Structure formats: structure tokens, C-alpha cells
């Protein structure tokens, strides 16, 4: 192993579900009260404090675990471009990843970006859910593409603007997710999550070395895959069901939580989430 990093006292994250700590409520309550066509009130009332989970996300996790302080800028549903999943919100706010970092940038009043601070991307996995669920046209191998392009430019734009410190998180194994297994789009997953996780630390690793940065790649799919392949080690019980079914419709949750992988049909419970948070600080001295 190599040495660890130097510690973290800053967190500014970028994403969708995976990470979000409230912004889509908060969003999604002030588009309600507006009146904007076709708003819902998100996550919904099955999940915890606004997060689309039973508990706190991995970066809120990785947070804790490094004794830094989190401004979590991540929204569900985000994209890795400008928009969401959920398209009535584009002519409100453009809360993909390159929207999540314009506002970061106009939220400093020309203030400077705060170079110790560890810059958090995890996202992409809405590139492919709205492809799927859209019927998108682009073959899954350029919507992979476009993804990373999308990934790396956010980098570029926050370095430009005086980012030093990144971690960037790769895809997660979309192709065990339950929407996805019911979907029968397993193949499909696996063909665009390897595209991704192929394509993108290349590219980082590129960028890191141009612009001086520190960037840190997290490799969810190995962690999932470790943590799927030996689930007693980790008290996991039941990797495939939903704790807490919401499709068709809601269903009572089940009793034992921790013991479960996924909450609902696209995200996981707050000890997978735990878990994830723990071994993404593994890489940063406390
Ligand atoms: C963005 C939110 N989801 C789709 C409806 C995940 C893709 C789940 C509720």
C-alpha cells in the first residue's frame, strides 16, 4: 500500500441519491410551493431526514469518519450533465452535476474555492436509469462515453476554478440493483457500469497528473462485490429484496434493516452506506 493521504477537514460533494443529505426535499418542497408543473414531493415519506435511504449517506459517513464538516451540493435524480432524471425540474434548476458545480462556483461571491478542500463526484448512475426508463437512443456505449466526459469535465471546471483535492467514486454495480433485475436489464447494466469504470479513472488519472491535482478513485464495484460475495462477515442477510418495497406500490418495511442490502428498488440501507463511508475513507489519515 501506498502512504495515506493528507487529512480532510472540508467535504464539498457532488451527486445524486447516492449521496444526497436533503437538497431534494429542500428543492422539491420550495418547486411545490411555486406551483411548478409536474413537481412531487421527494424522497417521499418511506425514507429518513430527506436522504433516499434509512439512514445517512456514504459521504456523510466518510464525513464523520475523517472529523471534516460536509457541504452536500448532490441532488437525486442528478445526471452527470446539467439536468435530473426527473425532467420538470430543468426549467427550475439544472441540478446535474455541471448545474450542482455552477452553483457551487456563483456561491462564492469571487471568494476563493478552498484548495485544502476534498472535492466529492458520485454520479451517474440516472445517465443510465433515464436511458432505460426513456427509451434514450444513444448506444449504451456512448451514453457511457458521455458520461465520463461529463465526470472529467466537472473536474476540470472546479480545478479551473482553484479545486485541488478530489475523490471520485465509480459506478456502482447498477446490474444488481432490484429495479434493474426486474427490469430484465442486467446485460445492459454490466455493459455500461464496465464502460464507465474502464474509461474514467484513465482520464482522471490524466487529469490529475496536467493540473497537479490529488484525486482518489473509489472503486464501488469491487467494494459491492466483496461485500455481496461474503455477507455473514458483514451481517448481511438479504442482498436482493427491497427492505422497504415502493413498486408498484409501498409496502410495509421489514423488521431488520441492518441486515438488508437495498432499501428500496434503486438505493441501499444506511449500513451499506456505513460500510461504503468506511472504506472510502480508507485511503485519508483522521
Ligand atoms: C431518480 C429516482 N428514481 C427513479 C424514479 C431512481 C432512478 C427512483 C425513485
Redesign the pocket.
Known sequence: TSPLLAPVRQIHAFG??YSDNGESQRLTREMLAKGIAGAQA???EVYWQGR?SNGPTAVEVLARQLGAQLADHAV??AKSGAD???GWMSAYRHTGLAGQVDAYLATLDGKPVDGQALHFIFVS??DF??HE?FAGEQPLEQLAGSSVANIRAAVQRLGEAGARRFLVVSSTDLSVVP?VVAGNRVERAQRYLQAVNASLPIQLAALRKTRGLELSWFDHLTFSRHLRRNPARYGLVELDAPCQP?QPSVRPACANPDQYYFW????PTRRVHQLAGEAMAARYAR
Do not use: K, M, R
Open positions: 445524486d441519491s421527494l424522497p417521499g433516499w437525486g435524480g435530473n432524471y426527473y448512475a440516472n436509469f433515464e426508463d429495479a415502493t428500496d428498488e434503486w438505493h
